């Protein structure tokens, strides 16, 4: 997946998205994005938007957005027990 | 084919799609075949996420995991 | 092309397709699928559906569906005289 | 470009598209060029199968084969 | 980019396009095509059509169409000073 | 990402899109990030060319070139 964060987005940036202190962006295959959306919905301080699905946008304060992005990335790696 | 499971999905997750959701992504031919195995599986509800993009399987964890296993087994089975 | 057969399809499977004892499925490039559709239309015991074109679905009894699939595959290989 | 011919097409085949049908698939630029050669060819009717996906050429076998040959010749013809 | 010219197009060819002595055709990525469209709009003797954007069609007399195609191709190569 | 600039665009060029137009093409995630840099840049107007395909930046040459430089710098910036 691709991960990006936009700090202090302009109204124009929000308008492009929807046509927040921070915007976390995640792009991938739909199956990956639906999984990521679930982690983000369970994260405190964030609002989740499915950009139509092409992209996943996470809105909130920087700290909450960064924490939700870290959680999504950690769950994505999925290096569980018996992985070999 | 890609296989994923979401345990205890939120309403928001279900809203994006529409106690466990099994997700399967592949080529349409593969997904139509997988949908048939899932429809024949006990304890699961099947949803084609649409031009079909993804296959979603709803139910209790045990039933979802069992349906995913049968789909994967039927896909990977000759010289 | 990709070839698959679904034996004793559920109503749900038919609903996914249309949104039969057997369903023969063929996926390929449109030119290949239009050619395949012609072989299937000339085959006894089968009904042909163009899934919109993404996929070609052949409906009927197993024997008729398998015979139509074999014919499509045989015509596709096209190892005619002077092929080199 | 891909080239195929369907001899004695059924009505069902014609229905999917809309005594011989010549089919040509390629990039749009190539197909628009091919359509021009086919429109200038004797005994054939030209149909752009649509965002144009495929080019269909209808007529008697001899005319369809002759139009296909001219399209292929014009496409493959310098140092 | 791909470049083609159709000399003495039939009405059917024009109908396929719009659904001229010559038709210049240019296919590429949108950014490349928008740049090409500008060169063509500044060229004498030609009319420019964006085929929807999939393709760029240039209409006019052969000489004007060929001159506009040459200009587009020359500007596309962009081997300017300090290129290394 | 692809970057291009059109100096003194014609009305026809502007019509295809909708004294200098800066064009940036890339993946949506990259383009949304670039759009933010461009919206924060002096002397430029930002247009998302649409499902967003391309980013167009309008203004005087100096402002357009400065906004393009900042987009490119922010994109290319660790071990």
The span from the CA of B16 to the CA of A81, in Å, is 30
Q: From which experimental method does this structure derive?
A: X-ray
Strand partners, A6: A23
Residue to test with chain A: of F26, F33, F36, F77, most A Cβ within 10 A: F36
End-to-end CA distance of chain D: 22
Partner-chain contact E13 D27, CB within 8 Å = no
Identify the residue among D35, D42, D56 best suited for mutation to test binding to E, counting E beta carbons within 10 A and taking the highest: D35
* Helices A62-77 and A30-41: angle between axes, nearest 10 degrees: 130
CA angle C72, C73, C75 (to 5 degrees): 65
Of A19, A40, A10, which is closest to residue A28 (Cα–Cα)?
A: A40
CA–CA separation, B11 vs B18, rounded Å?
Answer: 10
How many angstroms away from the CA of A11 is the closest CA of chain B?
24
Query: Among all chains, which residue has been given the structure tokens 């002096």?
Result: F42
Other Cβ atoms closer than 10 A to D79? 1
Of E28, E29, E22, residue with least CA distance to E7: E22
For residue A35, what are its two tokens?
């999984």
Letter string b/e over residues B12-29, b meaning 16 or more CB atoms within 10 A of that residue's CB: bbbebbeebbbbbbbebb
Supply the DSSP string of C29-80, one letter for each residue: -HHHHHHHHHHHHTSTTEEEEEE---EEEEEE-HHHHHHHHHHHHHHHH---
Q: Which residue has 């149909």 as its token pair?
A: D47
> Is the CB of residue D27 less than 8 Å away from at least one CB of chain E?
yes
**Angle (CA) D34 D37 D40, round 5°:** 150
**Following CA atoms E13, E15, E18, E19 in sequence, which dihedral angle do they give, to the nearest 10 degrees?**
-130
E39 touches chain F (CB under 8 A): no
* Beta strands B44-49 and B54-59, pairing class: antiparallel
Domains of chain B: 1-79 (3.30.70.1710)
Q: Is C5 within 8 Å of C22 (Cβ atoms)?
A: yes
Is any Cβ of chain C less than 8 angstroms from the Cβ of D49? yes
| Token pair recorded at residue B65 | 């995991």
The residue ranges of DSSP E strands in E10-83, in sequence order, are 22-27, 46-51, 55-60
Q: Are C22 and C62 in contact (CB under 8 A)?
A: yes
Query: Which residues sit opposite B48 in a β-bridge?
Result: B55
How many CB pairs below 8 Å do chains B and C form together? Answer: 41
Cβ atoms A13, F35 nearer than 8 A? yes
Q: Do F51 and A51 lie within an 8 Å CB cutoff?
A: no
- Rounded to whole angstroms, the Cα distance separating C51 from C16 reads 10
Burial class (CB in 10 A: 0-12, 13-18, 19+), E52: exposed
The resolution in Å comes to: 2.5
Task: Round to whole Å and give the CA distance between A1 and A32.
Answer: 8
Distance CA F72, CA C10 (A): 54
CA–CA min distance B11, chain A (Å): 9
Asked if residues B23 and B55 have their Cβ atoms less than 8 Å apart, the reply is yes
Q: Which two tokens stand for residue E39?
A: 């060169």
Distance CA F72, CA F74 (A): 6
Largest CA distance in chain C: 47
Cα–Cα dist F54/F17, whole Å: 9
Distance CA B44, CA B38 (A): 7
Task: Report phi then psi at D27, rounded to 5.
Answer: -70, 150
Long-range contacts of B71-75 (CB under 8 A, 24+ apart): B71/B3, B71/B24, B71/B34, B71/B37, B71/B38, B72/B1, B72/B3, B74/B33, B74/B34, B74/B37, B75/B1, B75/B30, B75/B33, B75/B34
């Amino acid at each position: 997946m691709e991960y990006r964060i936009i700090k202090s987005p302009t109204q124009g940036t929000i308008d492009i998205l929807c046509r927040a202190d921070a915007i976390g962006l995640i792009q991938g295959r739909m199956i990956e994005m639906v999984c990521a959306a679930d982690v983000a919905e369970k994260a405190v301080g964030v609002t989740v938007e499915d950009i139509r699905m092409i992209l996943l946008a996470i809105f909130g304060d920087t700290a909450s957005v960064e924490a939700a992005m870290d959680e999504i990335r950690k769950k994505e790696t999925e290096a569980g027990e018996g992985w070999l």
